Amino acid sequence: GIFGAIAGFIENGWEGMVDGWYGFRHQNSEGIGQAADLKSTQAAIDQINGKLNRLIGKTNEKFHQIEKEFSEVEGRIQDLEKYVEDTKIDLWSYNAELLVALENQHTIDLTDSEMNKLFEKTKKQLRENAEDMGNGCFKIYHKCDNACIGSIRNGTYDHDVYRDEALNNRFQI
Amino acid sequence: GIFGAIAGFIENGWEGMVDGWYGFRHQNSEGIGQAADLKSTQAAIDQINGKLNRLIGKTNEKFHQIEKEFSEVEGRIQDLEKYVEDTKIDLWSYNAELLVALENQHTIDLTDSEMNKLFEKTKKQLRENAEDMGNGCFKIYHKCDNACIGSIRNGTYDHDVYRDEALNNRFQI
Amino acid sequence: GIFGAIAGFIENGWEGMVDGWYGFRHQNSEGIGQAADLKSTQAAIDQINGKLNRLIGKTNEKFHQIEKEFSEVEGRIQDLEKYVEDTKIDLWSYNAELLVALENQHTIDLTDSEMNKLFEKTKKQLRENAEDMGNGCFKIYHKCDNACIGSIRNGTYDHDVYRDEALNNRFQI
Amino acid sequence: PGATLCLGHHAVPNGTIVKTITNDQIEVTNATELVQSSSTGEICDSPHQILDGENCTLIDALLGDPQCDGFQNKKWDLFVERSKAYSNCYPYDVPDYASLRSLVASSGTLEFNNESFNWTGVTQNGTSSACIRRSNNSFFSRLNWLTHLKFKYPALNVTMPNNEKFDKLYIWGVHHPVTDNDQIFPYAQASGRITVSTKRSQQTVIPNIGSRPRVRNIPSRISIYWTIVKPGDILLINSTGNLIAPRGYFKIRSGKSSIMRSDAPIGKCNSECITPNGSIPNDKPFQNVNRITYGACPRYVKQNTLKLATGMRNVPE
Amino acid sequence: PGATLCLGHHAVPNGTIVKTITNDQIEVTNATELVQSSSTGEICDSPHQILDGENCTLIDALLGDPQCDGFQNKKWDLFVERSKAYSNCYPYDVPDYASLRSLVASSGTLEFNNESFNWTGVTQNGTSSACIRRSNNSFFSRLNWLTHLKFKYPALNVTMPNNEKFDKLYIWGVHHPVTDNDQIFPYAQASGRITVSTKRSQQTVIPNIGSRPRVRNIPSRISIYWTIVKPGDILLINSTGNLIAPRGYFKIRSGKSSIMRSDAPIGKCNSECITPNGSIPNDKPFQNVNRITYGACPRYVKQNTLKLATGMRNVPE
Amino acid sequence: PGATLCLGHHAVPNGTIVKTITNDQIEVTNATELVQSSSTGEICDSPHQILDGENCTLIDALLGDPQCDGFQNKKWDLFVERSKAYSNCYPYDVPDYASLRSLVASSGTLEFNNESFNWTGVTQNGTSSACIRRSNNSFFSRLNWLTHLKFKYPALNVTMPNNEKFDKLYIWGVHHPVTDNDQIFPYAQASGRITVSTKRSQQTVIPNIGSRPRVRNIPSRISIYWTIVKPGDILLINSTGNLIAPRGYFKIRSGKSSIMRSDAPIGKCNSECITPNGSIPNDKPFQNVNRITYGACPRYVKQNTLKLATGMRNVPE
Ligand SMILES: *[C@@H]1O[C@H](CO)[C@@H](O[C@@H]2O[C@H](CO)[C@@H](O[C@@H]3O[C@H](CO[C@H]4O[C@H](CO)[C@@H](O)[C@H](O)[C@@H]4O)[C@@H](O)[C@H](O[C@H]4O[C@H](CO)[C@@H](O)[C@H](O)[C@@H]4O)[C@@H]3O)[C@H](O)[C@H]2NC(C)=O)[C@H](O)[C@H]1NC(C)=O
Ligand SMILES: *[C@@H]1O[C@H](CO)[C@@H](O[C@@H]2O[C@H](CO)[C@@H](O[C@@H]3O[C@H](CO[C@H]4O[C@H](CO)[C@@H](O)[C@H](O)[C@@H]4O)[C@@H](O)[C@H](O[C@H]4O[C@H](CO)[C@@H](O)[C@H](O)[C@@H]4O)[C@@H]3O)[C@H](O)[C@H]2NC(C)=O)[C@H](O)[C@H]1NC(C)=O
Ligand SMILES: *[C@@H]1O[C@H](CO)[C@@H](O[C@@H]2O[C@H](CO)[C@@H](O[C@@H]3O[C@H](CO[C@H]4O[C@H](CO)[C@@H](O)[C@H](O)[C@@H]4O)[C@@H](O)[C@H](O[C@H]4O[C@H](CO)[C@@H](O)[C@H](O)[C@@H]4O)[C@@H]3O)[C@H](O)[C@H]2NC(C)=O)[C@H](O)[C@H]1NC(C)=O
Ligand SMILES: *[C@@H]1O[C@H](CO[C@H]2O[C@@H](C)[C@@H](O)[C@@H](O)[C@@H]2O)[C@@H](O[C@@H]2O[C@H](CO)[C@@H](O)[C@H](O)[C@H]2NC(C)=O)[C@H](O)[C@H]1NC(C)=O
């Protein structure tokens, strides 16, 4: 949420995109398509796996400890034993609550960041050949067939090739 | 601070804006005005209330505990009782200090984010009809009366209506 | 990493920049140069010093405590003494681990933010006189000698002076 | 000509300073205090059941020192012990006083059921000048001072089983006579002994002939012990002299009860959190009033103040 | 005409709700549970060495109650005590039972070396009807009940040094006779006493003549004590009556051993983390199964569930 | 033609690896160590007042074993006990040795005021061959060994009130004679007893006739006890034999004092934080040197190293 892409200027997610987390939809002369972006998807996934590696399978061995249940009333020493354990559990419970709340805020923000970076990267790529429609979509002011769209997704789009065509379309009356 | 809007490219805040946290000032043919943006204001406010709901009115009941003051010298057992309590208080004091420092950094950053998102949203809206002056203000290259300014604030501004007028003003000599 | 400048759209760092953390490289009629930006460098440095001031030289005095090593087997009371100390050390060890991991994520992100803000500030400054090449570099569409480059670095660049020259270069065929 | 549209944010003339991760002093538009640092000075009598000890310690009310007669069978969520308290019955000590005090406090009731022990071979109901009840030499209401019957004292052997479904709590003791002027007068022989046992436990005690420094003019002492008897179990009292006997048992319960040392007055008000300084509100997550608390309370921390920002950075005009 | 290129992200039809810093209910595409809240119900016998106490407490196996004869010299990582356990030898108590239990549990072995004490001036190997071993009046296997030799009982004075490199653990006791029918029968005099000392330590105990409430039809008691003797040090037993003597010493080790109260059955499976409810997996960092654990275990917390997001915010189509 | 303007950041040839929330190995331009992991090996004698025990335990200096005579009335912030220490006076034990040691350590002074007790009816100043002071049979400087006067020993009854504004600390004891060769020689009768009481407290002790294993050739023992007497209160010593008496009281203070076990040498240097391994600097917030510390110290953690990034991510050229 903190970057403004996911649940912000991108109206909603795509349930039909099942082979990636982020990607592209286009409309051109040859039809309407969709392709996943692997690099941004893998960036988000690696970061979340990084968090998982810190939390899953990382336990601590403990052996002989203090007693934690009692069948007789004893006073002072039993009070202290119960108090120590109750103190400890509240501190760990606090740690677990805070951890999840913070990690979750950060997971939501990093994933929004990855969407935003891909959008930004794509905008720079298009130079003067397109305009931002404000909803995550670019209007491209030149004929851009499937190979051309593929060139943008693959980072091989040469903006000089189309620039005369696009400037002429952009600054008409 | 992390997005660069508040205490960054926006020179300062407006003490005269009392009905919102974020908003618009304009100069046009009909004068100079101000209107608050409710959606961005409410976004920031909801997030801060979210933090408040986690921290205010959420206490823990405790009943019989250990003694924490002593009128006689006793040694070993009293040392342990005092130590347990001093240990506990230092850990909670640490938790409280860290909580406030982190939440405060995050509150400052989220509020800066909301300013930045509104700015960004407004820039996309204007398309080729305005330019960013670098201080949070746009120079709009067309006649834009009170209804037009209102259309931008309300998200109903139609950029095609003014585009010929604006392109002609923008690319003059 | 969260803003996308450092280890993102800026391919790599400059080992040859030894007098600042962030800065400018240019190519113009008069050659190829480099100058550090002090304000962005000092912004990042102050924030990291802020973290240091919270962590370095801030210790707690403790005096008489409990015993933590034992030469005789004793049972119940010794179990509790050992347990209290082991509990405490695990909680502090947890605090230290989490602190470093979070502060380090945040240091990496704030430094990326400072790069991004300088880039953004410079882009707005150039108005219609340059285009973003997508790798942190701007193509400037006018003659821009050493004094002109200096004017951009110093925040005194007057974009109107070059605008006719630049628009003409930008929208050619 | 055109127009200009400027995006912006509010600011206030009266900002507040907060701490952050990167800066110990940043001004924000608004903040709220997370540490509660004040009490009204009174312990609110609601919603917890408060029992003001007044002149009585819990232990004096338990043993039944005459000035504590009004406490018989009372319950409490929180028993409040006053610094002005004092004992005014027979001088005594309790080995592990702190544990008995704690376990009664936590039980939260003084409910006492009388029991008929087969005391034949002794004079029951011994009294003294140091324990004045209703302007007449008396004793601890829950104890039964046992002395001789006609220059003789045979081997006692009394039994009492627990058929109930709660732990029974038995309070009993030993008399330690000041000289041989009260070792041949109330017990009729040179030596004495007491053995209070159960199926699982045994406690035995030797009376001690010797003078002590006077406490309200009396140089003898009693020593107080206790015994918990579970369901299905039995209490046995073998005795050859000196027994300070129970008149019955206390019920021991479990729940939320406790005890607190405080001189704060009791007020007619409603507050969930009690400290020795008085009740405090519990809106805030933390407090620096007292490490000793009872109820739904903020957590004790060392800091006086912790300000949480509730607005953006303040950047004045 | 041109083209349109839209950037976007996935969404799912089945999102999950998580907590965040600013919102207690945000839907994400996916999450994983951090709190382990279930056991299979069985304690896995691997990879920790489990010793099922069955009918025996650790203490009964230590003293050598006949039904615990199969436990002699066994070791354990974890000794499991069952609620169905019961003693069936001579009635006894252990002052500070909890500490002896703990130190044996932690030592993790019942290794016992026999020792030849110079017992002349008494009858060794006293037995009773309450401790039936192999259908014959017997006693605790590791204790030696010492009585008279021909209407007499002189002052014992036996010595035994520790030349080994481990702490020796000596278990010993006192007999408390029911009346004078077993104070003049097994010891031949009015009075008795026991003094078990070392270079650094001394413990002395008085036998107690008196009737107790019957426990499996016996109204006498033994009281059990212990003594640790280090390398270079010596054990001394001065005794004038009533001694329940050691037959030797237990080895005390240090390591990872402990004891747990549980009725869960032992399974033929492999699990690092044991609770009283059974073994639990330890993939998750936290657990709400039991505050009592043994092995590489998740940390106990009060929460039932804590969901960590493993995907972006879900914004359905 | 125009120009090109590139924005960028620095990098270094020698980066350092740090941990983050999302990556356990990220290279940054610079970092600093947060865990202190080394000591110089010496305890700095400033700014805390150090008292090197040398051959003496705190308890030996307290009782006044002749080799500890130089410690009389000294104060300390930190008393250092050496592993080479040993006692060389009369053999003794202290029930709850650890508590007496702790409360003296914490008091931080050996200030002793002599007091004139009315000892008539006994021979004062008993000595022995095992406590050699100035090449002459002697005793513990702060104790007064009390024996008979002409084949007789009557019932002692000495009183001493505390009119001061500090707690008085009284150290006293019992002699346990090896046989009847030193039960009829120094006390003139079959039996003995000691009762040290106050207005609030009473402790009574029985001497024990019996041989112990020799410790520096002596088979008798003393047992050491203590009594705290508050302002307005009084000390009473009833005794019928065997008393090891105080010569006066220790002042008990409160403050920052403690005790530490260490063999590290004392250096002429200034360091706020002391561990048993030596002083350590306290610039860093954490340390893995020792869980035992004294002074303004970093907090003990299990980790060897924790690197905090002090620069951006390093992305080499
Ligand atoms: C600076 O920042 C703080 C925090 O964001 C703001 O203070 C909050 O303001 C709101 C609205 O004025 C307060 O809401 C009110 O809570 C009352 C409960 O009082 C006690 O309990 C709360 C915890 O629940 C304690 O924090 C508090 O100190 C009190 O002890 C209610 O009684 C109020 O109800 C009244 O108004 C509502 C209108 O919606 C009606 O429904 C009711 O009938 C009734 O008349 C109300 O809900 C909130 O308590 C404040 N919080 C704190 C922590 O102080 C400041 O407003 C802000 N300053 C500026 C200038 O913006
Ligand atoms: C929602 O989010 C979660 C977390 O990101 C995803 O669940 C993970 O999915 C991966 C891949 O399917 C799982 O990886 C597998 O781990 C198995 C180990 O099982 C136990 O141990 C782990 C901890 O290590 C526990 O968390 C887990 O509950 C088990 O008790 C391995 O046996 C698997 O190996 C198999 O596949 C690999 C293929 O690479 C082969 O090499 C092997 O031969 C073998 O066939 C595998 O490594 C991971 O365990 C899951 N984690 C959790 C916490 O559940 C969900 O996939 C995701 N959901 C969606 C729809 O995206
Ligand atoms: C990598 O990152 C670290 C941390 O940002 C940098 O190290 C710091 O560098 C500064 C400046 O060189 C150091 O500042 C100096 O502190 C000295 C105090 O020494 C002790 O106390 C500190 C805590 O206060 C400990 O951390 C430290 O280990 C020492 O034990 C002062 O004596 C210095 O004063 C001298 O210089 C100043 C100039 O301003 C003069 O005023 C004085 O007269 C005097 O000559 C100075 O203030 C700081 O101690 C370092 N911190 C740490 C934690 O190491 C590295 O510089 C950085 N590396 C690179 C390549 O950038
Ligand atoms: C609780 O006790 C007080 C105090 O009374 C006692 O003070 C002791 C120090 C000691 O001197 C003792 O002998 C004395 O009785 C009671 O207040 C006192 O009550 C007496 C008799 O009614 C009056 O003469 C006094 O005015 C009064 N003194 C003070 C200082 O107030 C009080 O009655 C009692 N409270 C309850 C609820 O029982």
Ligand SMILES: *[C@@H]1O[C@H](CO[C@H]2O[C@@H](C)[C@@H](O)[C@@H](O)[C@@H]2O)[C@@H](O[C@@H]2O[C@H](CO)[C@@H](O)[C@H](O)[C@H]2NC(C)=O)[C@H](O)[C@H]1NC(C)=O
């Ligand atoms: C563990 O002990 C059980 C229970 O046996 C005892 O139960 C006590 C309450 C008491 O009545 C005591 O006298 C009794 O011996 C043993 O199971 C019992 O074994 C007996 C004799 O073999 C059988 O007659 C019963 O069927 C059986 N009872 C039950 C309820 O199962 C059990 O043998 C023993 N286990 C081990 C491993 O030693």
Ligand SMILES: *[C@@H]1O[C@H](CO[C@H]2O[C@@H](C)[C@@H](O)[C@@H](O)[C@@H]2O)[C@@H](O[C@@H]2O[C@H](CO)[C@@H](O)[C@H](O)[C@H]2NC(C)=O)[C@H](O)[C@H]1NC(C)=O
């Ligand atoms: C602290 O004591 C040491 C050690 O002296 C004792 O060692 C014991 C194990 C035991 O044998 C005992 O009888 C012996 O006295 C003192 O050092 C020793 O001092 C003696 C007499 O001056 C010398 O003959 C030795 O050289 C010397 N031995 C060693 C190993 O150093 C030391 O004097 C004393 N220190 C202080 C400050 O009192």
Ligand SMILES: *[C@@H]1O[C@H](CO)[C@@H](O[C@@H]2O[C@H](CO)[C@@H](O)[C@H](O)[C@H]2NC(C)=O)[C@H](O)[C@H]1NC(C)=O
């Ligand atoms: C032991 O000594 C105390 C103190 O001297 C005796 O108690 C005093 O006795 C007198 C006269 O008998 C009383 O009037 C005082 O009240 C007591 N004084 C104090 C200060 O308590 C005690 O009687 C002596 N023991 C014996 C057996 O005589």
Ligand SMILES: *[C@@H]1O[C@H](CO)[C@@H](O[C@@H]2O[C@H](CO)[C@@H](O)[C@H](O)[C@H]2NC(C)=O)[C@H](O)[C@H]1NC(C)=O
């Ligand atoms: C609440 O009561 C406590 C306990 O009396 C107060 O803390 C003590 O304050 C006195 C006088 O300032 C100090 O001499 C003590 O050292 C303090 N004791 C402890 C244990 O900290 C506290 O000031 C009171 N708080 C309020 C808000 O009234």
Ligand SMILES: *[C@@H]1O[C@H](CO)[C@@H](O[C@@H]2O[C@H](CO)[C@@H](O)[C@H](O)[C@H]2NC(C)=O)[C@H](O)[C@H]1NC(C)=O
């Ligand atoms: C002390 O009292 C108990 C209880 O009355 C006596 O134990 C009982 O004695 C009878 C007959 O001798 C036995 O058959 C019972 O088994 C016992 N009953 C209970 C309930 O335990 C005990 O013997 C008495 N002491 C003496 C010395 O006679």
Ligand SMILES: *[C@@H]1O[C@H](CO)[C@@H](O[C@@H]2O[C@H](CO)[C@@H](O)[C@H](O)[C@H]2NC(C)=O)[C@H](O)[C@H]1NC(C)=O
């Ligand atoms: C594991 O066992 C514990 C202990 O018996 C269970 O917790 C108890 O549950 C009972 C019945 O619900 C309550 O009456 C007790 O108050 C609980 N005791 C404690 C100490 O919390 C627990 O429910 C079991 N857990 C699982 C997952 O089976």
Ligand SMILES: *[C@@H]1O[C@H](CO)[C@@H](O[C@@H]2O[C@H](CO)[C@@H](O)[C@H](O)[C@H]2NC(C)=O)[C@H](O)[C@H]1NC(C)=O
């Ligand atoms: C109890 O036994 C011990 C050990 O045998 C006796 O102490 C020994 O006595 C001899 C000769 O009297 C001494 O020379 C030795 O130094 C002692 N040996 C050891 C190993 O300590 C002790 O005297 C005996 N008790 C009685 C009353 O005679």
Ligand SMILES: *[C@@H]1O[C@H](CO)[C@@H](O[C@@H]2O[C@H](CO)[C@@H](O)[C@H](O)[C@H]2NC(C)=O)[C@H](O)[C@H]1NC(C)=O
């Ligand atoms: C400081 O001293 C401690 C205590 O002796 C050292 O920790 C011990 O190290 C030894 C030998 O490596 C181990 O056998 C012990 O198990 C350790 N004890 C504890 C309690 O951890 C420690 O290594 C020393 N540290 C430094 C930096 O010198």
Ligand SMILES: *[C@@H]1O[C@H](CO)[C@@H](O)[C@H](O)[C@H]1NC(C)=O
């Ligand atoms: C600022 O001033 C107003 C009006 O006096 C006051 O109600 C408000 O609480 C103040 N805010 C802060 C943060 O001090």
Ligand SMILES: *[C@@H]1O[C@H](CO)[C@@H](O)[C@H](O)[C@H]1NC(C)=O
């Ligand atoms: C002892 O006193 C109680 C209470 O006043 C009374 O009921 C009882 O009859 C007395 N007992 C005897 C044996 O006189």
Ligand SMILES: *[C@@H]1O[C@H](CO)[C@@H](O)[C@H](O)[C@H]1NC(C)=O
């Ligand atoms: C969503 O549905 C799939 C298929 O039924 C399932 O495997 C997956 O775990 C579900 N995910 C969540 C987060 O509920």
Ligand SMILES: *[C@@H]1O[C@H](CO)[C@@H](O)[C@H](O)[C@H]1NC(C)=O
């Ligand atoms: C006592 O019993 C043990 C074990 O059965 C036996 O070896 C020993 O000879 C017996 N001792 C005597 C003195 O009879």
Ligand SMILES: *[C@@H]1O[C@H](CO)[C@@H](O)[C@H](O)[C@H]1NC(C)=O
């Ligand atoms: C890198 O090299 C310099 C010069 O050798 C050194 O002073 C500096 O501390 C090094 N920095 C790191 C982070 O290793």
Ligand SMILES: *[C@@H]1O[C@H](CO)[C@@H](O)[C@H](O)[C@H]1NC(C)=O
């Ligand atoms: C006991 O010794 C002390 C110290 O040397 C001395 O002052 C005192 O006079 C002696 N006491 C007697 C009664 O001789």
